[PDB]
């Protein structure tokens, strides 16, 4: 496939110097960030929980800002 869906480290996500194959603007919820992965796809970034994912929780809930 033209994507690997390899979720890179968060340290990579701060820059996200990936590649572009399936890249576009996905349905990121507020509070999150969306960066480009080297495998050619954008992933979601959550700064509150310091996590990343390919699946947007936006579909079920919008910005759920983890306070602490």
């Amino acid at each position: 496939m033209q994507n690997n869906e390899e979720l890179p480290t968060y340290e990579e996500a701060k820059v996200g110097g990936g590649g572009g194959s399936k890249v576009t603007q996905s349905f990121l919820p507020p509070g999150w960030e969306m960066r480009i992965a080297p495998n050619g796809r954008p992933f979601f970034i959550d700064h509150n929980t310091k996590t990343t994912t390919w699946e947007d929780p936006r579909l079920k809930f919008p910005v759920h800002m983890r306070s602490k």
Side-chain angles (χ1 to χ4, degrees):
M1 56 183 180
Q2 300 183 270
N3 54 271
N4 299 90
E5 296 178 83
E6 175 185 80
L7 188 61
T9 308
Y10 201 94
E11 304 301 271
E12 300 297 278
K14 57 77 178 183
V15 52
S21 56
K22 187 180 299 296
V23 294
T24 187
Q25 297 91 152
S26 304
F27 299 107
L28 67 172
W32 295 70
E33 207 294 85
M34 179 180 59
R35 211 67 175 203
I36 305 302
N39 64 90
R41 186 184 176 204
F43 60 100
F44 306 104
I45 297 168
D46 182 282
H47 287 246
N48 301 273
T49 54
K50 303 296 282 60
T51 55
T52 49
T53 180
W54 297 102
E55 301 170 278
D56 65 278
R58 177 292 313 185
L59 54 65
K60 193 64 60 179
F61 300 101
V63 53
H64 182 254
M65 181 180 61
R66 180 64 190 189
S67 306
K68 187 76 291 299

